[PDB]
């Protein structure tokens, strides 16, 4: 067994992030070098993301994670610096990975980054797949992580810098565990997530955070061309770290179902942001999309006000 740490000091914190093939883990433990170590954390089982508010700004850190299984082994992730100084060989920019998973062993891929609307090409592009442990590059964001089919994988993945989008759904399942995301607000509305397909359904779990300024986690698209639904969201776990201006859309009519379990949002207030908003799906051409506003306990929106807290 291994366990993948990779770290994003960025947005005045230190992001830690990884993925485990240790099965039946009942705790998790986080240290942070200074006895040449010491535990600044005791973990659920299933976060693979930590935040650090407490290291000094100036000081270079290491970091490690140990899993503790129900056979009581205790499995150490690799060493991780904030300074700086194995992966598969389909690990490439632009790759298209089919029915397997890829180990990119932390490496940083991108393509580049137009700053236009249009559609930009993705920098993997998963059919029924998985991928872990991946850098995308600050300049070379493009349109991210593609799920063209089946189910999808993404796993301790972190995003440098949110380009058009971090990750996008056409497949049956995409589920995001961990996973560091960041962006910077400004022409299109910013947005993490992006699932046109219908019958589709996008999972986010262990403790996948945003960091920095953000637009939209996600949004069904209320007047799209050939619009309808159900198109499912389901937060198992997530953290925004930083700004952003709504968490999910969804729309009443097309049946779309967001499912929201732990959401944890820096200095949360109820209606900032939203958490789940519901709205009235169209066809393009056939007027505006309106909206009805935050809902909870609803067919639509599946969360209530004790799954979300603030931080």
Known sequence: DDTMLMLLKKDNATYLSWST?????????????????????ELNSSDRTFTDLTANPQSDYWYWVDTVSGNNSVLKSNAASTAPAAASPECKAGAVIKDKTVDCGGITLGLSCSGDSDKQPPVITLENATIKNLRISEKGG???????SGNCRIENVIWEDICEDAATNLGKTMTIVGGVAHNTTNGKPDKVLQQNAKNSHTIVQGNFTLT?????????????????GPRNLTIISATVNGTIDSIAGVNRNFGDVAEIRDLRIKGYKEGKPPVCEEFNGVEKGKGKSDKYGEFWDTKNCKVSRSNVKPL
């Open 142 to 148: 493009s349109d991210g992580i593609h799920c063209k």
């Open 212 to 228: 920095g300024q953000h637009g939209k986690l996600w949004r069904s698209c209320g007047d799209c061309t050939n619009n309808g």
């Open 21 to 41: 093939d240790a099965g039946n883990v009942v705790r998790q433990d986080v240290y942070r070098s200074t006895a040449g170590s010491e535990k600044i954390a």
